[PDB]
Amino acid sequence: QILPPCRSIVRTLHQHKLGRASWPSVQQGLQQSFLHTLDSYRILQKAAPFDRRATSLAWHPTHPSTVAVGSKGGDIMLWNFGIKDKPTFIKGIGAGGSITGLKFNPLNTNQFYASSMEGTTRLQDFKGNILRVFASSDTINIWFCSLDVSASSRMVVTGDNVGNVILLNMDGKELWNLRMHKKKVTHVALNPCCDWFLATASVDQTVKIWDLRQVRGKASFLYSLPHRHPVNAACFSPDGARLLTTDQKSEIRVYSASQWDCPLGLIPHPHRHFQHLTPIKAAWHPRYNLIVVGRYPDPNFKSCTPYELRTIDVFDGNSGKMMCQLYDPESSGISSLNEFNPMGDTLASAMGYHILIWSQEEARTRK
Template structure:
């Protein structure tokens, strides 16, 4: 027993267990920075116990006294700070370079690409100020329309039936067509695209006419009710099918030939006043009509028989002032008589794409406010009539012109000039979008980018007379052949003139 106790004990803790090594290189081609392959690692079976050294045992038994091992706890009553999830700036940016880069990476763009396209124009739109104004009427403006071929000319109509062709760069000159006065308000008008000197109009006088605003100034009457109790409120022309349609205050729509005015049929398609009608320029058989019966109806002109023949009926909460197709004819913008703008998307027109809350309530002695499209971008422009009962009303709210993004429904710009304070009912952009025409009471306003105009004027003033005229470099070029010929001709002409003068003098002397 003593001998056994005197035998030295084997150090089992330091005894190494030899096991077969297996190459654990997952990829034989992987190498270290020194150019050699990775060292193989040992793989231990799951059931075989692992080797425990004194150091490992010490670590397992070590209490958590190190700073890194301490678990920090918040005091009672405090909550951990919430970090909001924010997309990277590159994904939120509307910069065109960022958008094109994401498109190259096949990243979903959504509406960001459209916003990147329109963003430079919005920056320019914020610099719009009133450049020209005129008040040629004795009553308020009721309709306006840009000339289709003259970019700085528009037609303006008044409540008394007066109609003028106005070039805002030459404010002293008007082509005036005198109206009947009280009760002859022009409710709607459109240019004759085949002959831009002509304008189709509908009026409270009960007539649908074609005015010639040229030198003749004649008027061709297509429809006449001969009654002050029934008048026409809306008008639209279809050039592909040579049609003209007009709606009256009883809900009747009359279809006629555009050139001759021959009546084709008259049908009551709405229960009350047909405030707006418009043909789709891309789909020539599609017609949209709006009424104070709180409905917008889509029609196929080839199959219009009664109210039940409508393709789509778009119900609204309030009576409707207008329903305009977008420039690409894929959307429909409606304006009610209180505080809502709606955008419907085709070809299934019963799907409402967007609803925008905006104060523009109806008032009897105010031209109805109508929202219109921008000709190049998906923007909507409409005048604001502040209302204290409106949910988003703010104290001392200004009567501005609001511009909305049709894709998001957000307001991107507000136009306000300190020199005017009235309610601006009518707003229409020019064909290029560089000017905005507005009707405010008795006055007409033209908005343009004043900053851009100042830059152009300063550049013109900085130019020298030589730069404004012929190029100085061209005048300095040596002309070998033409110059001597001109000199010779001039010399011959001069010689001929001198000879003729000598002969005249000789004749006079001989007479004496």
């Protein structure tokens, strides 16, 4: 395979110590170094099963080794590494209560937000106590699909199966529930560097950029970006300037700050949507300009590589092409969800009925 990297590494660091070379060149060199050491994540560290399929994933923001996960049957799990304290569990109905959105609480880490097929955007503890419901369908067969949160703004946002989005405060205060789309809202997210423009994606083959404080007039939006197929995810950058989008058939798109309408590059990659599989969500890496996605081969997709395996692919953002591929037998499932740690030293993967941890090996000999 490819993975060639080269450079005059330490020199640049000293160049940075002299002021000659600019910081983005440093960021590029250490991005390459990060890829080189990610070539040693090949040894899969840990595996974890449980009951009904995995649907949503989330990282403990402050802690590297802690992670939370939510199932197809409303079964939530909280798991920490190097603890061995037999991780924490909570069950649900198990049939039609699929948790589908899951973000940690920025305030109380022993709390968590959740969006469920039951029709209940809730705030609940890992010990089982429901602290507070935020919204409700009040009529079954109409449920939520999307959820996200912001701490700098102290806001909650959630999306439906019909095309209307809801926006609440941390203490209630609902001033929202206007309709935005014609179909289900697959993903949604707020800017981390801003507080008052939003992004939402839907089955309508359109992804919309809103201004949550200015617009109130039922599709008096700010921007609307089209696509050729429906969209499973539209995720913001940490920096805030790059919006990543991933469709259902075969595509990834990078939109910029600079003219949201036009895209900067198209990254073709197979992640074909499917009914009983968990929907695929590309994701950023929090401290570089990389992209990470899970692959799902299609015999009809125009493959550039002659070898098409199920594996975790890692591309470069501002170029378009690939830079690394992680693969491990005994894990021949399809990695629906993949998310790097906010810390930057660990990767979590959610496959059907399985959760995988990929971190570096070392510790050749103890003393």
